[PDB]
């Protein structure tokens, strides 16, 4: 029979073996979602790029109530992953206006200070300690706090509801809706506060520009902001943590960064290629009859791509399952492809480069505290593949 999603991960920080199995047997494979509906998964690099840039695979149709469920937030609000066409383009323009090059430059010292303080907390601790609880989670929460113009504690409360918003089959049906309502109320209240008293933050600049341009309704802005919050907290945390786990397991790769900090930028490209934050992408629904890689898909078929699998495709990368932070050229699609490609790719690259430069400079002899085989996935039923904890140690 056909395989069921979520797939197993005997190694939590590595892709599910099912991905390579399908990649080397069927380019468009049927899979059974937890809701029972059958969907088709695309796993090859060239094919994944084609689907993500093929407007016949629409996120809007995936947000339609009749469409099968995957992540609740997509069907509960006009998220950026719930729309297409001119409506989506207009929202991305506004977001791109806020994430302008001047904004990135101004954020460089802000990120450096957040990284410094988190690493100050690590150095002051007595090893072993959970790197995730002490460093990456505070960093991810405090970065989003700067984007939203709120206090770090406020983002911590928001993050509690993010798991429900991205729950494929982890959280109960009743608690999802109650945690979703709380998440919406928080974001709604934040937006209204910033509209009344805009500050020096990304959210305020977008809210002010939209108010002047009168191009998005308040509900559409909330939908976009919800997407930013859901995608901007857990994903950086998962990549940093899982990425570090790979760096400390393949310990010779961590040492390469210690040896030459000028190559950390290149290493970040390999980190995002090698440690994606999800197993498959958000749901798409085919709107017309199409033929993809010799496979016919009728209108209404639910479709999934796997950037995780694409970034391991031996047709695009030499020795794709090897972690090589010096890999160059490295033409991955870790930040997506097509209209829904990550709007924060430049911001995220700067953030990860700042962090891994500082970490490797201050903790050159960092090590895994316990065996690599003891790592566990935080939540199999979550869209994210972040691990439960990463215990590390260093000479004292
Ligand atoms: C702040 C905020 C933020 C941040 C930080 C981030 C970070 C990130 N990210 Fe991002 N994203 C986002 C926000 C975000 N994000 C959004 C909102 C989206 C959606 C867009 C659209 O849809 O249009 C995305 C999208 C996206 C995608 C696509 C998906 C699909 O298509 O389905 C991907 C792949 C990614 C990745 C990523 C990474 C890798 C990172 C790091 C590392 N992203």
Curated annotation (Swiss-Prot):
- Key words, A-Z: Cell membrane, Heme, Iron, Membrane, Metal-binding, Monooxygenase, Oxidoreductase, Transmembrane, Transmembrane helix
Keyword set includes Hydrolase:
no
Where, by residue number, does heme bind?
A: 342
| Record flagged with keyword Cell membrane | yes
* Primary localization class, coarse: membrane
Its annotated compartments are: Cell membrane
Origin: domain of life: Bacteria
Enzyme class per UniProt: oxidoreductase
Query: Which cofactors must be present for this protein to function?
Result: heme
Gene3D superfamilies in UniProt:
Cytochrome P450
Enzyme Commission no: 1.14.-.-
- Any single GO CC term annotated in Swiss-Prot or TrEMBL for this entry: plasma membrane
Which GO molecular function entries does the Swiss-Prot or TrEMBL record give?
heme binding; iron ion binding; monooxygenase activity; oxidoreductase activity, acting on paired donors, with incorporation or reduction of molecular oxygen
Q: How does it sit in the membrane?
A: Multi-pass membrane protein
Membrane-crossing residue ranges in chain numbering: 221-241, 290-310
Extract the InterPro entries matched here.
Answer: Cyt_P450 (IPR001128), Cyt_P450_B (IPR002397), Cyt_P450_CS (IPR017972), Cyt_P450_sf (IPR036396)
Family, per the entry? Answer: Belongs to the cytochrome P450 family.
Q: What is this protein called?
A: Putative cytochrome P450 141
Origin species, per record, is Mycobacterium tuberculosis (strain ATCC 25618 / H37Rv)
Which gene underlies this protein? Answer: cyp141
């Amino acid at each position: 029979s056909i395989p069921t999603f979520p797939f197993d991960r005997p190694v939590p920080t590595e892709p599910s073996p099912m991905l390579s199995e399908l990649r080397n047997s069927c380019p468009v494979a049927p899979i059974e979602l937890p809701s029972g509906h059958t969907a088709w998964l695309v796993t090859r690099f060239d094919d994944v790029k084609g689907v993500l840039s093929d407007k016949r695979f629409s996120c809007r149709a995936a947000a339609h109530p009749s469409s099968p469920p995957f992540v609740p937030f997509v069907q509960l609000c006009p998220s950026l992953l719930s729309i297409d066409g001119p409506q989506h383009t207009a929202a991305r323009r506004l977001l791109a206006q806020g994430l302008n090059p001047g904004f990135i430059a101004r954020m460089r010292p802000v990120v450096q200070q957040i990284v410094d303080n988190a690493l100050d907390d690590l150095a002051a601790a007595e090893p072993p300690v959970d790197f995730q609880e002490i460093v990456s989670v505070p960093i991810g929460e405090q970065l989003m706090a700067k984007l939203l113009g709120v206090e770090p504690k406020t983002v911590h409360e928001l993050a509690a509801h993010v798991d429900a918003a991205m729950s494929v089959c982890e959280i109960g049906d009743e608690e999802v809706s109650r945690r979703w309502s709380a998440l919406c109320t928080m974001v709604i209240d934040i937006l209204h506060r910033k509209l009344a008293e805009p500050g020096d933050d990304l959210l305020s600049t977008i809210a002010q520009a939209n108010r002047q341009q009168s191009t998005m309704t308040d509900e559409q802005v909330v939908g976009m902001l919800l997407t930013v919050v859901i995608g901007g907290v857990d994903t950086p945390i998962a990549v940093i943590t899982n990425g570090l786990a790979s760096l400390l397991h393949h310990r010779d790769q961590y040492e390469r960064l210690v040896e030459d900090p000028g190559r950390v930028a290149r290493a970040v490209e390999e980190i995002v290629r090698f440690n994606p934050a999800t197993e498959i992408e958000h749901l798409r629904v085919v709107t017309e009859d199409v033929v993809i890689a010799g496979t016919a898909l009728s209108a209404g078929s639910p479709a999934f791509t796997s950037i995780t699998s694409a970034n391991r495709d031996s047709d695009q990368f030499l020795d794709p399952d090897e972690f090589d932070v010096e890999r160059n050229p490295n033409e991955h699609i870790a930040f997506g492809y097509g209209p829904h490609a990550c709007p924060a790719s430049a911001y995220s690259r700067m953030c990860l480069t700042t962090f891994f430069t500082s970490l490797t400079q201050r903790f050159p002899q960092l090590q895994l505290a316990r065996p690599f085989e003891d790592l566990e996935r935080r939540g199999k039923g979550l869209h994210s593949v972040g691990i439960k904890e990463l215990l590390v140690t260093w000479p004292t």
